Design an enzyme around this catalytic site. Sequence first.
Site, PDB file in Angstrom:
ATOM      1  N   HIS A   1     -21.742 -26.994 -24.409  1.00  0.00           N
ATOM      2  CA  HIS A   1     -21.437 -25.758 -25.077  1.00  0.00           C
ATOM      3  C   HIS A   1     -20.406 -24.929 -24.356  1.00  0.00           C
ATOM      4  O   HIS A   1     -20.636 -24.536 -23.169  1.00  0.00           O
ATOM      5  CB  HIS A   1     -22.689 -24.905 -25.400  1.00  0.00           C
TER       6      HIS A   1
ATOM      7  N   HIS B   1     -21.796 -24.783 -20.450  1.00  0.00           N
ATOM      8  CA  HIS B   1     -23.043 -25.280 -19.936  1.00  0.00           C
ATOM      9  C   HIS B   1     -23.468 -26.482 -20.777  1.00  0.00           C
ATOM     10  O   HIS B   1     -22.845 -26.725 -21.811  1.00  0.00           O
ATOM     11  CB  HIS B   1     -24.216 -24.264 -19.837  1.00  0.00           C
TER      12      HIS B   1
ATOM     13  N   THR C   1     -28.783 -21.074 -29.088  1.00  0.00           N
ATOM     14  CA  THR C   1     -29.847 -22.027 -29.173  1.00  0.00           C
ATOM     15  C   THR C   1     -30.908 -21.680 -28.139  1.00  0.00           C
ATOM     16  O   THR C   1     -31.944 -22.372 -28.150  1.00  0.00           O
ATOM     17  CB  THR C   1     -29.413 -23.526 -29.203  1.00  0.00           C
ATOM     18  N   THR C   2     -30.572 -20.680 -27.307  1.00  0.00           N
ATOM     19  CA  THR C   2     -31.648 -20.270 -26.313  1.00  0.00           C
ATOM     20  C   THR C   2     -31.859 -18.778 -26.505  1.00  0.00           C
ATOM     21  O   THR C   2     -30.974 -18.071 -27.064  1.00  0.00           O
ATOM     22  CB  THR C   2     -31.229 -20.681 -24.843  1.00  0.00           C
TER      23      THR C   2
ATOM     24  N   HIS D   1     -26.871 -29.157 -22.248  1.00  0.00           N
ATOM     25  CA  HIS D   1     -28.250 -29.377 -22.628  1.00  0.00           C
ATOM     26  C   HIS D   1     -28.433 -30.881 -22.440  1.00  0.00           C
ATOM     27  O   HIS D   1     -27.456 -31.585 -22.803  1.00  0.00           O
ATOM     28  CB  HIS D   1     -28.681 -28.996 -24.079  1.00  0.00           C
TER      29      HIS D   1
ATOM     30  N   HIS E   1     -32.312 -22.267 -16.439  1.00  0.00           N
ATOM     31  CA  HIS E   1     -32.485 -22.951 -17.742  1.00  0.00           C
ATOM     32  C   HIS E   1     -31.408 -24.019 -17.933  1.00  0.00           C
ATOM     33  O   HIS E   1     -31.634 -25.002 -18.636  1.00  0.00           O
ATOM     34  CB  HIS E   1     -32.667 -22.105 -18.968  1.00  0.00           C
TER      35      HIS E   1
HETATM   36 ZN   LIG Z   1     -26.126 -24.124 -25.087  1.00  0.00          ZN
END
Ligand SMILES: [Zn+2]
Length: 258
Positions: A117, A92, A196-197, A94, A62
Site C-alpha cells: 500500500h 507499508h 483497511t486498518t 500486509h 501493526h
Molecule cells: Zn495497508
Amino acid sequence: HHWGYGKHNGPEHWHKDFPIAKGERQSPVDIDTHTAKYDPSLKPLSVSYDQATSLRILNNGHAFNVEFDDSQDKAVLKGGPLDGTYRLIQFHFHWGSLDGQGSAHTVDKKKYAAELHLVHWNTKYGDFGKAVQQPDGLAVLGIFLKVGSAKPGLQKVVDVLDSIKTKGKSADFTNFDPRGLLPESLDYWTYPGSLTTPPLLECVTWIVLKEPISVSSEQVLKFRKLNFNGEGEPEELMVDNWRPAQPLKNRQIKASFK
Ligand SMILES: [Zn+2]
C-alpha cells in the site's frame, strides 16, 4: 481491548470500537474480474516519484511504514480516476504466515502472498489529518506480491528489518526509490472504499494494479520475523496483518483495461 490481528482483538472485533467497520464503503473487497466494468473514460495513472524523499522506517506494531517527506509536491500521483494531486506520505505491506495468504484484496477469490500500500493524500486539504475526513481525501495504490524471483528494489527494505524488529523502533531510511516497487504495467481496477486498518475511515479511492510483482521466498521470510510486541514483551510474530474481504454493497469496480 486494543485492536490487532489475534483471536481476541482481530478484525471480527473491530466494529465494537470502530462502528464504521460495518459501513457502506468498507475495504478491502474481492475483485470479481467478470463483473468489473471497463471504463474507457478513465485516464492512465501518472506516477511522479523522481523527487521522492524517504526519511524513515518505523515498526508501528501493526506493520512497518517507510515515510516520505510530504511537505512539498515531490512524489505525487495524479490522473487515473483522480481529480487533483495526491502526495505520497508512506508505504507499508500486509502479509501472511504462509505463501497462500497475506493480501487484503483478492482477485476472483485468489489471495496473494502480500499486498503493498502506497498511501497518498489530496493536497487540496492541506495536511493528511484533514484529508482522512473527506470522501476523496486519500488515494491508495495497491500492488500484489507473489512468491517467485527476488525483487532487487525491495532488498534495501528487507535488510533494515532486523533493526526495527519490535514495536516503536525506527531507523533512518533515506534515499530509497519507490519506483523499484512498480510492476511493468500500470493497468488497474478502481473503487471507492476505506482504510483497511482502524480507524477504517471511508476516505479512499483505491487503485489496484492488475499486475503483481514477484518477491523471493527469502524476502518474504524476513517480513515474518518482525514482531507485533514491543521490546522485552513476549514474542508475537508480525504475520497475517490483513483484513478479510468486505461486502461490495452498492459499489461498482471499474477497470482501466479490457
Ligand atoms: Zn495497508
